[PDB]
Amino acid sequence: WQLEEAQVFWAKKEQSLALSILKQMIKKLDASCAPSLKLTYTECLRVCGNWLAETCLENPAVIMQTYLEKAVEVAGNSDELRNGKMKAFLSLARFSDTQYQRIENYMKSSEFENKELALRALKEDRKRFLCKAVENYINCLLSGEEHDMWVFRLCSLWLENSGVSEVNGMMKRDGMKIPTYKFLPLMYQLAARMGGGLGFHEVLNNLISRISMDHPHHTLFIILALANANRDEFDEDRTEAANRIICTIRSRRPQMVRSVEALCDAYIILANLDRKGINIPADQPITKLKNLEDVVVPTMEIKVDHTGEYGNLVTIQSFKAEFRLAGGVNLPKIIDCVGSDGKERRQLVKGRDDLRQDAVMQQVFQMCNTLLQRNTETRKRKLTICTYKVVPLSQRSGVLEWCTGTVPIGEFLVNNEDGAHKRYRPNDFSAFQCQKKMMFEEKYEVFMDVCQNFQPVFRYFCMEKFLDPAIWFEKRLAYTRSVATSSIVGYILGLGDRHVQNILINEQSAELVHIDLGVAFEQGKILPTPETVPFRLTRDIVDGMGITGVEGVFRRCCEKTMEVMRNSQETLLTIVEVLLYDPLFDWTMNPLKALYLIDQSFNKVAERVLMRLQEKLKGVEEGTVLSVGGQVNLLIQQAIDPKNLSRLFPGWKAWV
């Protein structure tokens, strides 16, 4: 009963207020301990350690007292047990991870600060207590589902751990701990660095294989791609060998589904797709022209659907030849393939294209959605993020599915021209405002006229398409949330291009998904005349919905959005870090050559991003952290800027 004073950790926001006494009471309970019911109290006594973490005033020794007392609470040691086990082994990780994070700081902040044996012992304080935390994370890993989030931090650790710690190999010997059913989600992050030192890499590769042994049905696509990514039909490549070696682990995979790879190769033959413009028939002939009909086989191209039993799924059963394609610098290839259900995936395809680089974000998104999915507060808003399921199966190329609802909104503006925007302003008048390019304060005036000469019409857009205004009132929430989420992500996301090239919304969904997949977190600053704010067109603002300062809808969520972020505040940085240094980070590169219009320092800049991310999560680069609403309202203010609009560049110059 008394434990409710755990409320009074913040219920009295005062710590210790009961709590220390409660901790004393816990100590008293810990005394009163001298059955498993108490283990719960011990689990409470563990949560006391978490409540001690709620202080987080304990010396790591006082942790080596209290977290040891927690470790003793951890030694308090099956249903709630698992919960406790996680509530320990993870807290056991987490606290020791917290220590290990302190020790990570006291690695890194020390690596900052320190850059002896003591440090090595501090390194051991990592290489034990962290490794212990890691073990406890391994234990956390061992623990079970629902804490699994830190597995990135673990993976991050494992990545940090990588190159050292046959202890991590021991932890990989312990690596049996989790289901790959749990583990799998890192597989991409796995692969990139997956292939050097055997005790890490091959062991990892083995462990990867050991993991990858599970649900190649999920994984082999990565694997296939992980291999296939280098091919061209018409340097740290040990991975490729390891990949070949994995291809042996993949050969260990019995499937001989490599027909699917041939289908990829056919898709790679489709990567040769190249050129009669029209509403597109007649893509059939090549890639083996339905390539054995695409008869039911390893299957489900984009098709991100997953199972813990997986190895049970829906099949390939056909491919629609003569398939479409869209345009582009790479004309997007529209891949019509009929699954077992014969639903024909319309599968987006583009060459010379780094997808996992983007799909990182998708992956980043992927559990971010879970991260989204976590607080029912979101579920209260039921506020999510869209998923473009793709692969860079070729380093040039190899998966997506383009379904519906690409928002050329500017064509819908050409259809806003075809809408009310008759008698408004030339499309190229924007280009004339883009001829206002040469300047700048003049521009700071100039297009306001065009802006005056324009209006934010798109609110009508599918509102018109809507009837039963419920749906409108409903999709309004998408047009709130589905609207919001991205920009809601975006700054936090360290988002990418505002473009039509960003702009899309799923109308059948009646939700708004604009995937640029464009930037690094800060690559928006990597631009020539870089500029940013949170993406929202006045039209989008108008199209947020009719009224209310649309944050004056969104912010309510947008804060609640920022909340989970704040709630996540560090957490994703692990994913982010897990993202940060990997091979696809040619993605993270915020890259060069003006992207068709060191790394540590980048990682420092990434840290600076991570700072900007620390800024992003309940910080601010304005120190404006000023939580979320203030942060948002400021961010809202920040995103509000006509001057930013005035500062805008070519891509969102479209938005102008």
UniProtKB/Swiss-Prot annotation:
Every copy of the PI3K/PI4K catalytic domain together lies at: 319-598
Q: Changing residue 618 to N does what?
A: In B-cell chronic lymphocytic leukemia
Residue stretches spanning the membrane: none
**Region: Activation loop, residue numbers:** 514-538
Q: Where is this region: Catalytic loop?
A: 494-502
The reported result of mutating residue 332 to L is: Loss of phosphorylation of target proteins
Where does the record place the modification N6-acetyllysine?
Answer: 616
- Effect of substituting residue 454 to C: In AT; mild; decreased phosphorylation of target proteins
The reported effect of residue 482 to R is: In AT; uncertain significance
Consequence of mutating residue 365 to L?
In T-prolymphocytic leukemia
Q: What stretch of residues is annotated with the motif Microbody targeting signal?
A: 646-648
Annotated family? Belongs to the PI3/PI4-kinase family. ATM subfamily.
What the protein does? Serine/threonine protein kinase which activates checkpoint signaling upon double strand breaks (DSBs), apoptosis and genotoxic stresses such as ionizing ultraviolet A light (UVA), thereby acting as a DNA damage sensor. Recognizes the substrate consensus sequence [ST]-Q. Phosphorylates 'Ser-139' of histone variant H2AX at double strand breaks (DSBs), thereby regulating DNA damage response mechanism.
Disease annotation reads: Ataxia telangiectasia: A rare recessive disorder characterized by progressive cerebellar ataxia, dilation of the blood vessels in the conjunctiva and eyeballs, immunodeficiency, growth retardation and sexual immaturity. Patients have a strong predisposition to cancer; about 30% of patients develop tumors, particularly lymphomas and leukemias. Cells from affected individuals are highly sensitive to damage by ionizing radiation and resistant to inhibition of DNA synthesis following irradiation.
Q: What is this protein called?
A: Serine-protein kinase ATM
Q: Which gene encodes it?
A: ATM
